[PDB]
Structures are given as C-alpha cells and as structure tokens.
Design a protein around this ligand. Structure first.
Ligand SMILES: COc1cc2ncnc(Nc3ccc(F)c(Cl)c3)c2cc1OCCCN1CCOCC1
Lengths: 312, 122
C-alpha cells in the first residue's frame, strides 16, 4: 500500500511528480522522493494515511508553520500540499500530501560514514550547531513564537548546498503552559501526557517530567534540547541516554573530564542544560556566544560544511 | 556499488565543441534518472543537464539550453553530453551522477567519480 505508492504519478499544482523511492517509514506517514517530469527538479513527499482527525488536524498546522518559516536558509522549504478524502484514496483512508525540497539526507547517516576519518573538528561542530540555532532563532522570532519540542540530530538535514536544515514540525506548537498552585493534580497529569507524546524520551525536559515545580513549559524547551545536541556532537553520546527521569529532573549529567578537543563548548553546554527553564540562555544569547567563538577561530559558521558535502 | 567513469574532456577555445561520455556500473541503469554536473572553481558544484529513464524527457539549465545536448544508451550503460558554442563559464570539472537536482540547480547526488576536465580559454 504505502509501498505500492512507488512508481506512481502525483499531480500537485502545475507539477507532475514521479515517485522514485522511499526515504523514511512511519507508522502514520511515509516520506518519498518525488521528481518532476517537466523540470527534472526533485522533492521530498510525505504521504499521511489516517482517518483519525487528531492526526489530520495536526498535519494541517504542520503545514501552516512551514509556510511561515519559509525563506530561511536553515529550514527546509515548503512547496505544496493537498487533501484527499477517504473516498478518492485507494487505502480507504484520508490522504494528506506534504511536499518539500529534497536534501542530501539526514545528518546522522553522513556522520557515521565519516567516523572513519577520525574525530570531528571543533570547527565542524561549531558550523553544525550554529546553523541549527539560527533556525531555532527564526522560529522563536515568529508571532506567536513557534516551539519545535522535538529537536534532535535525526531531525537535522544536510542540504544540497552543504548547510544544516530543520525538517519535521509535527510536534511544533505555539502553546505555552504556565502551571501554578491553582492547577489540579489531574490537569497536570493530562497536560503531561499530551506533551510526552510529541517528545523523544531522552530529550524530555525537566519541566515536562516534574509538573509540581511550577516551571513554565514554553520556548525554553528547545534550549535544553540544543544542549543535548551540542553534547551529542562533541562526545558523540547523549548526556541522558538511559532516559532516567531522576537524572533529568535533578539535572545530573557528566562531561568527560579529560576532554582537550571540545573545551570551548563546555560553558555553553552547562548554561543550556539548566534544570530551571527560567535560568537557561535565550536563543539570542546562544547564537551571540557562538559568533564570538567563530570569530576567534577565523571560521565563517554560515559557510557550507564541505567535508560532509563530499561524503558519499 | 555505484561506479561511474567520465571521459572526453579537454582544452578548447571559446566557440568550440566537445563530447563527454560516461560508463556506469553497479546499479540498474535502465530504471534511473541520470544527470550531468560540473564543478566550477569559485562557485562550487552545479547541475547542468538531466535525462529520464527512457529518454522521454530531457532537462537543461538556462545557461546551456539549445547549446548542450544530453543523451543515453541503456544498451551499453552509457551517458553522453554534446557541448557546442562553449563559453568561459562552461569551464569546469564535469561529472555524471544519478537523480536530478533541487532549488537553484543544486545536484542531489555528490560525484564519487574522478570526472573529466573541460577548459575554455584562448
Ligand atoms: C535524499 O535523502 C533525504 C532527503 C530529504 N529531504 C528532505 N526531507 C527529508 N525528510 C523529511 C522529514 C520530515 C518531514 F516532515 C518531511 Cl515532509 C520530510 C529527506 C530525507 C532523506 O532521507 C532520509 C533517510 C536516508 N535513507 C536511509 C535509508 O536508505 C536511503 C537513505
């Protein structure tokens, strides 16, 4: 079914798209490579098949967010979308099509095929993290501010230009939560279960695990996730890999004491992984400090990562 | 194990003509979109021309339309690019890759082959 979608032709606007191959599987939607028969241009096509209005209403807001985040060099470009009823669809399910620009692929799969070369330079990590934060900043500039809530290296894409792009926005939202003592225990439990679904276990923030601390669940979620990513780019391993709630809530992690390669990022990691979201650096503060590092290293952090670009 | 090998490039003054060829192996050439790309010093990599599986469709970038001609031979797994009326901007290291491009003529697959040099100057 979503496997027989390969080799078919889809009409979106003035485009006639040939489905080339499967890029990613999902329990709800598959991502395909689509090529235009008239231009030769390539695209990324996500195909959602579900009769659940919760998932259907979710992908709609996913589209609206991308249309607003359009134009940015560090965010994947939205192209077109279409709705298909349960009736016209062959699977007997409501169909939704999400069309974006095609990239080289995920950042992760390029990193493992280059570990043979050796450890990543402090410059490359700086380039990847900066371009990642510049995309998050653009999200936090929108009105109202857009929170990703699902920031991870698996959601980082390597563009054809050789730059980092953000991809998935299914967990994205503009809603913030401000729990006080007027909140019931059950309301806390209900809100938690909702946010938990849209997050990755080891990336879950302290404010969404402990909801009796009156911590605001806002844009500072993405900052904590970025701190996990920076740690994950230097030491290759996740600071909270076991996903133990006690370690995340108490903010208990360890930086390799004998590190002599990524020492510059030590201050940023500790400053982004604060338990209280009110004490974490804003996205502007993070970007600003990243620019000072790049200046002191004689490196343009906006320039393409050519070492990953020429990776096959 | 996708392997490619280009040849037929050299040094030719502006207005001249060259013919690039490419032998492919390791994949099923008959069911794949093929493209020609070039590497211009100072600019980077850029998509030039592409052709469908059964040659039912051929695409060219704006700077080579009506000047370059792409063609293929599924019987020999070959890919040809006929260049004519060459300009200075045509100077670069030409590769052949699978699939097409995205955005502003930016190739999907990065070249793993050696390529063939094309130089245009007096
Ligand atoms: C050519 O490679 C990609 C380009 C992509 N360009 C844009 N977006 C991608 N993913 C994506 C992610 C989230 C979304 F909501 C949508 Cl619509 C699309 C892409 C995923 C891609 O592939 C990711 C998985 C890599 N596969 C792994 C299996 O073997 C083939 C390589």
């Amino acid at each position: 079914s979503q496997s027989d979608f390969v080799g078919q032709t889809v009409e979106l606007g003035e485009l006639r798209l040939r489905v080339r191959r499967v890029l990613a599987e999902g329990g709800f939607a598959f991502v395909y490579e689509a090529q235009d028969v008239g231009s030769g241009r390539e695209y990324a096509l996500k195909r959602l098949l579900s009769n659940e209005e919760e998932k259907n209403r979710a992908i709609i807001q996913e589209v609206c967010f991308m249309k607003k985040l359009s134009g940015h060099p560090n965010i994947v470009q939205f192209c077109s979308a279409a709705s298909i009823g349960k009736e016209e669809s062959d699977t007997g399910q409501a169909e939704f099509l999400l069309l974006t620009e095609l990239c080289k692929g995920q950042l992760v799969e390029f990193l493992k095929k280059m570990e043979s070369r050796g450890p990543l330079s402090c410059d490359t990590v700086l380039k990847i993290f900066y371009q990642t934060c510049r995309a998050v900043q653009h999200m936090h500039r929108q009105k109202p501010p857009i929170i990703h809530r699902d920031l991870k290296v698996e959601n980082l894409l390597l563009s054809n230009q050789g730059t980092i792009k953000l991809c998935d926005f299914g967990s994205a939202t503009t809603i913030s939560h401000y729990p006080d003592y007027s909140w019931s225990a059950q309301r806390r439990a209900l809100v938690e279960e909702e946010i938990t679904r849209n997050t990755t276990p080891m990336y879950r923030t302290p404010e969404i695990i402990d909801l009796y601390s009156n911590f605001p669940i806002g844009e500072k979620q993405d900052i904590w996730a970025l701190g996990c990513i920076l740690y994950l780019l230097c030491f290759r391993q996740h600071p909270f890999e076991d996903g133990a709630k006690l370690r995340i809530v108490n903010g208990k992690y360890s930086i390799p004491p004998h590190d002599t390669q990524y020492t510059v990022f030590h201050s940023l990691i500790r400053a982004m992984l604060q338990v209280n979201p009110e004490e974490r650096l804003s996205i502007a503060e993070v970007v600003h400090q990243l620019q000072e590092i790049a200046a002191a290293r004689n490196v343009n952090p906006k320039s393409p990562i050519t070492e990953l670009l020429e990776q096959n | 194990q996708v392997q490619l090998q280009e040849s037929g490039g050299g040094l030719v003054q502006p207005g001249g003509s060259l013919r690039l060829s490419c032998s492919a192996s390791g994949f099923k050439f008959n069911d794949s979109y093929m493209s020609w790309v070039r590497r211009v010093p100072g600019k980077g990599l850029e998509w030039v021309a592409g052709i469908w599986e059964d040659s039912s469709a051929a695409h060219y970038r704006d700077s080579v339309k009506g000047r370059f001609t792409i063609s293929r031979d599924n019987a020999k797994n070959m890919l040809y690019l006929q260049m004519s009326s060459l300009k200075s901007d045509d100077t670069g290291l030409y590769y052949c890759v699978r699939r097409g491009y995205s955005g502003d003529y930016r190739p999907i697959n990065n070249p793993s082959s050696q390529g063939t040099q094309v130089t245009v100057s007096s």
